[PDB]
From a paper:
Flavin‐dependent halogenases (FDHs) carry out substrate‐specific and regioselective halogenation reactions in the biosynthesis of various halogenated natural compounds. FDHs are a promising alternative since they are able to halogenate different moieties under mild conditions with high regioselectivity. Here, we show that the tryptophan 6‐halogenase [name] efficiently brominates the tricyclic indole derivative tryptoline (1,2,3,4‐tetrahydro‐β‐carboline) with high regioselectivity. Tryptoline belongs to the group of β‐carbolines, a family of natural and synthetic indole‐containing compounds with broad biological activities, like anticancer, neuropharmacological, or antimalarial.
To gain a better understanding of how [name] achieves regioselective halogenation of non‐native substrates and how the structures can be altered to allow for halogenation of similar or even bulkier substrates, we aimed at solving the structure of [name] in complex with tryptoline by soaking crystals of [name] with a tryptoline‐containing buffer. The structure was solved to a resolution of 2.2 Å, and it revealed the typical crystal packing with two chains per asymmetric unit (data collection and refinement statistics in Table S2). The tryptophan binding site of chain A contained a large and almost planar difference density, while the active site of chain B appeared to be empty. Like in other structures of [name], the substrate binding loop of chain B is disordered (residues 451–460) due to no ligand being present. After several cycles of refinement and model building, the difference density was interpretable as tryptoline in a unique binding pose. The placed and refined ligand has an occupancy of 67% and is almost completely enveloped in 2mF o ‐DF c (1 σ) density. In addition to the tryptoline in the active site of chain A, both chains showed fortuitous binding of tryptoline at a position where physiologically ring I of the FAD isoalloxazine moiety binds. Nevertheless, the FAD binding loop (amino acids 38–45) adopts an open conformation. The position of the nitrogen of tryptoline's tetrahydropyridine moiety (N2) and the amino group of the tryptophan is almost congruent. When bound to [name], the catalytically preferred C6 of tryptoline is sterically almost congruent with the C6 of l–Trp and has the shortest distance toward the catalytic amino acids K79 and E358.
Residue numbers in the entry:
A (entry chain A): 2 to 529
B (entry chain B): 2 to 450, 463 to 529
The structure:
Amino acid sequence: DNRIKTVVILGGGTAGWMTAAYLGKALQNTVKIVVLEAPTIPRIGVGEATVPNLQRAFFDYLGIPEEEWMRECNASYKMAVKFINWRTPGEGSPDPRTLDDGHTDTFHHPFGLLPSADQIPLSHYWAAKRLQGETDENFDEACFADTAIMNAKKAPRFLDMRRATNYAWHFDASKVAAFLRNFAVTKQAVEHVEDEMTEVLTDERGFITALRTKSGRILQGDLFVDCSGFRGLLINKAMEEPFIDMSDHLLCNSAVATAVPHDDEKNGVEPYTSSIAMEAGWTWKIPMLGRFGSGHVYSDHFATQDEATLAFSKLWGLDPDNTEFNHVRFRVGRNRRAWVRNCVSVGLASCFVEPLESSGIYFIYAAIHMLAKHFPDKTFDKVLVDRFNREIEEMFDDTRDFLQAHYYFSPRVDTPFWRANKELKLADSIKDKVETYRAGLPVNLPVTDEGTYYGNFEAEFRNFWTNGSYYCIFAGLGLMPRNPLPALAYKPQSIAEAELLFADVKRKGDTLVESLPSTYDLLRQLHG
Amino acid sequence: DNRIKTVVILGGGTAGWMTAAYLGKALQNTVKIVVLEAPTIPRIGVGEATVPNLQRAFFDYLGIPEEEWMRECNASYKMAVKFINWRTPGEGSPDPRTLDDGHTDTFHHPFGLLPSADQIPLSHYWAAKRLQGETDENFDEACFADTAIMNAKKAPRFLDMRRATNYAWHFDASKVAAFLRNFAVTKQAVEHVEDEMTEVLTDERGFITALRTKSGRILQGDLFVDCSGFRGLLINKAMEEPFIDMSDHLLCNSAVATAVPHDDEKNGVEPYTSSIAMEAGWTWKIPMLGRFGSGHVYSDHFATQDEATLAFSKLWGLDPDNTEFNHVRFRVGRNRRAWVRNCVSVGLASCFVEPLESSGIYFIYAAIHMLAKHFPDKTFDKVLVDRFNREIEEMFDDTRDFLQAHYYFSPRVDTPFWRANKELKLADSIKDKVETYRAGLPVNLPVTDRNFWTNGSYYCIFAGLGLMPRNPLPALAYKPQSIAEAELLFADVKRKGDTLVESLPSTYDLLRQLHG
Ligand SMILES: c1ccc2c3c([nH]c2c1)CNCC3
Ligand SMILES: c1ccc2c3c([nH]c2c1)CNCC3
Ligand SMILES: c1ccc2c3c([nH]c2c1)CNCC3
Ligand SMILES: c1ccc2c3c([nH]c2c1)CNCC3
Ligand code: NA
Ligand code: NA
């Protein structure tokens, strides 16, 4: 029996306790699991956003019903990221300015998949009409019924919990961590050691054999998961694996955040995450029951912490002298290798981007999914480790490129921050995709229906940012194809068939805006 | 109005008439379509095999029901390619030799999809048992109920046409061409010009402007599709686009073929294509109603045309002096670019590999599908042309790699041909996949009920030829519940196979019903 017998996970929070719970289930009680978590001072809950596959890929795999965990972490509902003021100059404001053409400066990035007609996505029929002046509708409203639902702040489910649309989740991350920690300890025999690490003990080859705690106890193991966050106490410090800084792709490096109490009854609750453009970055807004998490992501090359905190406070009309703020400086990039020897990095210790498209928890899940799939024995076959690393680096770089596109193709040039983003070099892959897009061709066309896509892990991981997402962002920001897809000029029936699709989207949106409960009401029912 | 107005297609046969029929439909009568087809000497019908998505990708787009076209080309059913004697030395024989482990030297590459347990394909559970000495079943018999159905030569559908398994088709290519030509002419307003091309007229920019015929008629056009076959009269000759020879990946370059009458009543009809290994290549067998097509594919570096013809005759006990044979020498590879200026190559004029995995017609309809989607206007946007070319080259090279795997990993070393295959260099992408396979990892895992040769297909060939992972997927060592669930899957395959061998009609009977 040459199997891993003990897995030691350094660090708790979402990364550590998601790893523990997942491997507990994946490894079917054949492996001892230890979490070594420093006890810490509970931070204000600044809110986390997610993508639709979370319930299916993670909580369902563990057999945790959606409502059970949502009730334990003040969870609310997410149908998109909504971008505000990414095209127009000015101070940060929660309220959208107006474009030169009269439109409001908002655009949505929802989760559905576009319908097609004659094997051509709805996006392309919309672009032909917009380019030809046959419509004044925005891409998001024309192509996703969810746009209308969001505009009216209606829920993604009916009150009897019948599904109306695709959605994901907002939640308090520390509450989810605490919930998973309770799950793993009581239901899965995880040992929790509440202590600090003082030593990393290694054999002649540099493989970790044990961790010493501050109390003297030695925790032996065969596989070590670094969930220590940005410090990367195992992968970067002990194992000396270099972190590739990628601030030459994404400039932001700091965040100031808080939770803001919120009059839900008065204002309603938005079923979406908002990315509010600022002078030196952007501010998230993540509605939960009674409060929203908010954080201003910024480059400290272009704004001082005091500057950013003042602008962030002004956004919400906060007293900066009488408000509880969390400040963080982040590294942007990834390790040269995510897994070295018998040390697997997961979460912040592995890689990070600003949460502009809710990447964080997905990255954690994808890594632990891939770890379970590439799980070694004590011979640590190099190919298993290499293939895992390959998946992590491709996953990360692809999302990195995608986020850069948000900044590079913003028309804003009103502050040195927004100007500086256009001095950065675009990755080859996004240059290629823009070329494809500008000729009227689809980018990363979906090959699966929506059920398969969000229901099969590999279907989404292998096609993560689809054609619809590129259209949401490019068109949202005002970047259009140079011309329509030339094939459309030869296909009058197909154009006619797309008109019916456009009309189906209108009818569904109108019906659901009329019949759906408010997000607020669905939340009140759910959380008692 | 900068639209293409006229499309001229050089060449008929399957490539030309599939192109014409497809664009007829895709372009919705907004474009004139002309086919310039040399009248030719009807060759003996040596048979073509296909892959399952022919009906969905091609005939369904045209709205032609499967039975309508099958009846018009003597079509039969294909559930796999069955490889015979690819592991054992000797002269060519239709009968399988015997392996060291007692199994017959046959293995199947069927179209079904493997079930999974705990997100791990059945293949990996099978491999774990075989590596640990817990089973002596072959991969195909353990993992595909279709293997049992094929062994009993049963049909993939019942007599009331309920589907039982995935399948594809065998047919007479000239009959399919003739059927599509009639379709395209009568139903899609395609003009058929029966004449020989004498000149290809080009402007100052190197764009084709017209073809002159031997009768004097000038055929003007805006976009030209080269379906002229291996000669590539437009893409290679007129446009001067270089052909990339890839005989340094696949050694075979010639074929001798015929049709063989067949006693269906006595023998039944096999619902599969057979690849019968020979000393200097291999021989296809493509059963149809009343005859099977057969052709010996060979490298002429290692056997003369006369050598191959004798060995091919010997396989089936033919009189080589009194049998009508067709002889073809092929180019293996692809053009440097499939589409140059206003000339799009489709079919043999674009690219070719030996029909070891029935690639031929797939290459045609994928190209025309891609042409319709990248269809240009008269400005011929460079990006449209480049993106089309990228798809053809990836499609071709990927299938090329897959075919090389069949030869590189044969254990045969009994003739200079089989020895020579191990001197060739493996492409980077196929080396990578072998590395992945050998660690027990899946290759190109299917995400569905882009990814053309999936994990199941790699196992069919690797395991079929005797190449196993170094060890089981290590994760399985931690998953006793998952192994127990896979056992139920294995039992489902036995129970399904047994039930269907008992309830299905023979292929022969289903064919009689269909063609009567
Ligand atoms: C907003 C935030 C994340 C996503 C993802 C999709 N749409 C989004 C919208 C589609 N699949 C990948 C993840
Ligand atoms: C900056 C630094 C860290 C973070 C984290 C989030 N946003 C950040 C911004 C949300 N997920 C948890 C961690
Ligand atoms: C700024 C950016 C991210 C964070 C996180 C906390 N505070 C922050 C401040 C605490 N919860 C987890 C993440
Ligand atoms: C070898 C060379 C050419 C061919 C063709 C088929 N098989 C071949 C084998 C099928 N019909 C069209 C052409
Ligand atoms: Na630049
Ligand atoms: Na000329």
